[PDB]
């Protein structure tokens, strides 16, 4: 059948014998009326307003202003959805303990789920207005809903329902998040007082100025995708840059880093220029794959279970033990992990693009105060100057693309082996072959790779300056018949660069062989050391497949560790060549 409590005793559970709030059926019956208040007032305001007034007409595509409490209310609304889908999964299978379909456990949370998504689209559309008088009833929603949850919550204390009940910990968290949603709405009352950048036509990038869910998922990048099949995109339809991330603004930040004050001077001034956006990128890179370690705990939790008031209210440890709730926890954790990894990748490439703008302006201001005795007599060639912008900034930019992975590999591998110690014990310390093997042999191939890269970069600069005097001097070489002699001179210096590449290729090959060869030896040494020599402990399938996904998630940045030790040595010699160019001989005024 159906109703909004069950027909279990069939004459009980709708009864009012005391005052009416003593029924738990009555307090989750009262827990739907703020949500249907918010749905049933906010549906005709959203239908005649933002959307379906035929909003093909444009109501300021650019200059999206953000309120006080924006970047807080979206994280709190996603925390409401993280507690509320868990409240849905708690109401189900406490429904499924007995029969005949209790709807009072999870239909209030589903009405709160629809109220949560309509309140966040109402807050985004009031943030398009700057008309916060048309906010105001949403604030009334929070001083409905919170109060009703506290009239739930003291009736958890009145029937002495403890902390080991899961819905106690759910609804106390819901009481305090409704409380801080009230605190941020009186913070909008504090500073806006109901009782923008001058974003012009030239800004068309919007990702500093869009909302946080479109900062994560790039909903602004559906436009310039759907219109790309209409029109081929050109240089005026992408617009101009904003004022932050201007090349002169990053140039002014680099001169402010310079006068605050060698190779250590340009490195420490570079970290003083860009380190706060760098630690934002690596902080997102810390929280990404710390979310991903809840992957293998879910793997152990589902195949551990698959290897195997009157109780039905409480669930907590069996709520963590069941399989479908861990699968939707895997879905929400993997959604949130790929969102933080793509956000970290965006702000790392954005900091590197601003650095390419800043040192291209600083390398041109070195060029405008350069004496021409360095070009003419001896030292600098014009091929080396256009390689110093065209190659030797791009190697540094690729190092700043790969920098927060270098800052987030130790917090991945240490929390991975401590979670290996939780899932396997000291038999997982037979697989400490990564920490007794990896970093001295990667430093040994970092020394051999860097000596090969220094010899390869000087041979490449000699081959490019020899091809630059070759190709400008074609007509004298074809008019005096020395082209085979000059081709053999390029061929011998090409053979020197080819032998430097041959040493580079055998050292790169032995590092990528050790890089993919040690984790399959780690699953060898953990699976044979669990069974043999530490004999008759256990061998479940559960910690076996949990440690297999743990060793695969250890090996997944290990294949990028060979890419990052392919990097940084061009950055070190590029900063060395840039400090040698930036301390060249200049013009006295």
């Amino acid at each position: 059948p159906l109703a909004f409590c069950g027909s279990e005793n069939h004459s009980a559970a709708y009864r009012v014998d005391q005052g009416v709030l003593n029924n738990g059926c009555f307090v989750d019956a009262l827990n739907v009326v703020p949500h249907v208040f918010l749905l049933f007032i906010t549906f005709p305001i959203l239908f005649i307003g933002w959307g379906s007034q035929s909003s093909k007409v444009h109501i300021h595509h650019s200059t999206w202003l953000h309120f006080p409490g924006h970047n807080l209310r979206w994280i709190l609304t996603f925390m409401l959805l993280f507690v509320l889908v868990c409240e849905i999964a708690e109401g189900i299978l406490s429904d499924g303990v007995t029969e005949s379909h209790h709807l009072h456990l999870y239909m209030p949370a589903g009405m709160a789920f629809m109220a949560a998504v309509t309140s966040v689209v109402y807050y985004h559309n009031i943030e398009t207005s700057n008309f916060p008088k048309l906010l105001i009833a949403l604030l009334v929603y929070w001083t409905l809903a919170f109060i009703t949850k506290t009239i739930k919550f003291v009736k958890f204390l009145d029937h002495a329902i403890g902390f080991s009940q899961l819905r106690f910990c759910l609804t106390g968290l819901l009481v305090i998040l409704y409380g801080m949603l009230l605190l941020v709405e009186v913070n909008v009352i504090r500073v806006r007082r109901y009782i923008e950048d001058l974003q012009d036509l030239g800004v068309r990038f919007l990702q500093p100025f869009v909302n946080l869910l479109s900062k994560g998922t790039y909903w602004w990048m559906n436009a310039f995708i759907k219109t790309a099949h209409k029109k081929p995109i050109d240089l005026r339809a992408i617009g101009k840059l904003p004022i932050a991330m201007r090349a002169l603004t990053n140039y002014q930040r680099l001169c402010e880093a310079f006068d605050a004050q060698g190779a250590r001077a340009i490195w420490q001034a570079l970290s003083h220029a860009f380190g706060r956006r760098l630690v934002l990128s690596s902080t997102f890179r810390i929280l990404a794959d710390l979310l991903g370690f809840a992957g293998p705990l879910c793997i152990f939790g589902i195949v551990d279970h698959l290897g195997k008031l009157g109780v039905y209210f409480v669930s907590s440890q069996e709520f963590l033990a069941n399989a479908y709730v861990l699968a939707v926890l895997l879905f929400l954790a993997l959604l949130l992990q790929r969102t933080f990894l793509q956000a970290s990748y965006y702000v790392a490439i954005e900091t590197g693009i601003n650095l390419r703008g800043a040192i291209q302006t600083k390398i041109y201001n070195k060029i405008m105060h350069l004496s021409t005795s360095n070009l003419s007599m001896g030292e600098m060639t014009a091929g080396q100057i256009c390689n110093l912008v065209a190659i030797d900034t791009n190697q540094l930019m690729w190092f700043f693309f790969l920098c927060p992975n270098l800052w987030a590999m130790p917090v991945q591998i240490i929390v991975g082996v401590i979670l290996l110690y939780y899932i396997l014990g000291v038999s997982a310390l037979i697989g400490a072959a990564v920490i007794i093997l990896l970093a001295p042999v990667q430093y040994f191939v970092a020394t051999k790779l860097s000596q090969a890269q220094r010899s390869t970069l000087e041979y490449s600069n000699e081959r490019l300056k020899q091809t630059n005097e070759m190709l400008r001097g074609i007509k004298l070489l074809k008019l005096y018949a020395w082209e085979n002699i000059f081709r053999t001179r390029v061929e011998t210096t090409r053979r020197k660069e080819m032998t430097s590449l041959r040493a580079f290729a055998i050292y790169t090959s032995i590092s990528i062989f050790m890089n993919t060869a040690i984790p399959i030896a780690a699953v060898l040494i953990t699976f044979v050391g669990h069974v043999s020599f530490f004999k008759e402990a256990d061998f479940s399938p559960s910690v076996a497949f949990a440690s297999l996904s743990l060793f695969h998630i250890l090996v997944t940045p290990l294949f990028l560790l060979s890419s990052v030790v392919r990097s940084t040595v061009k950055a070190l010699v590029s900063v060395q060549k840039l400090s040698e160019f930036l301390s060249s001989a200049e013009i006295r005024e």
Partner: protein, 272 residues
């Protein structure tokens, strides 16, 4: 596809391309064989027969990744040498009418940056490409082995991933090309401010060419930022599709091992 990668394979050679595809096919087959023997060995209810064949199949794994590693360094070395010294021999016998009509910076640009990405950037990218796509299709093979109604979950999902691939692709055939539309001025502008430095300091137009380089760097950084934001939009879309693949495979392996028999390790194969 394009013809020129087969040109790459005729500068590789038939023994290199066949040794490459043989080494990748047996290395990915021996890692899915060590996963299937982890399925056979974790379902206990004869011991060390499984551990003996586990150790020698892992010995096939480390020698197959060794011959993977040396075949990708030797195909990088042979296309490094072979795509030099033939372009060098075609440019040493050329007419003067070819040099007087073509721009010289184009020919030195293919001698410099294109030869740099052939001898440097391409063989690890080849390794990561072929390793990742054979890991993806062997993962699709072991997931489609266990839960065959995931074959029904083959039918929209990769296809609509193919559809959003087409909904990317011509925009990238705009926009990456638009990056080269603001790449080719700016370094040439650096060429114009190295052959003419005494003239520009004689004319005192240094702030004007400074402002022109600020405009060129503004256009180049907004084209790299829009190519960046298209790339991370495309990756957050398709990794949301991949987490949806994880969800539908997870709920059909839990629903097909609760009520059917999958022996509690094949679900670990599909989930890993």
């Amino acid at each position: 596809p394009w013809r020129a990668c087969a040109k790459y394979l005729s500068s590789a050679g038939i023994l290199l391309l066949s040794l490459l595809v043989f080494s990748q096919l047996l290395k990915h087959m021996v890692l899915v064989a060590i996963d299937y023997w982890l399925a056979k060995w974790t379902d206990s209810a004869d011991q060390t027969v499984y551990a003996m064949v586990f150790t020698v199949l892992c010995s096939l794994g480390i020698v197959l990744c060794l011959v993977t590693s040396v075949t990708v360094e030797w195909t990088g070395l042979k296309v490094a040498k072979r795509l030099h010294r033939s372009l060098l021999n075609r440019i040493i016998l050329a007419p003067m009418r070819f040099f007087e009509t073509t721009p010289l910076g184009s020919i030195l640009n293919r001698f410099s940056s294109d030869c740099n990405t052939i001898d440097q950037h391409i063989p690890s990218t080849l390794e990561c490409l072929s390793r990742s796509t054979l890991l993806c299709v062997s993962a699709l093979a072991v997931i489609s082995y266990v839960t065959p109604v995931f074959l029904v979950a083959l039918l929209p999902l990769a296809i609509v991933c193919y559809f959003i691939q087409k909904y990317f692709r011509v925009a990238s055939r705009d926009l990456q090309q638009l990056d080269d539309t603001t790449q080719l001025p700016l370094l040439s502008h650096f060429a114009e401010t190295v052959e003419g430095l005494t003239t520009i300091r004689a004319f005192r137009y240094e702030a004007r060419f400074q402002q022109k380089l600020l405009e060129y760097t503004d256009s180049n950084n907004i084209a790299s930022l829009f190519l960046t934001a298209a790339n991370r939009w495309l990756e957050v879309r398709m990794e949301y599709i991949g987490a949806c693949v994880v969800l539908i495979a997870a709920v059909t392996s839990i629903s097909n091992s609760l009520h059917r028999e999958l022996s509690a390790g094949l679900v670990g194969l599909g989930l890993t």
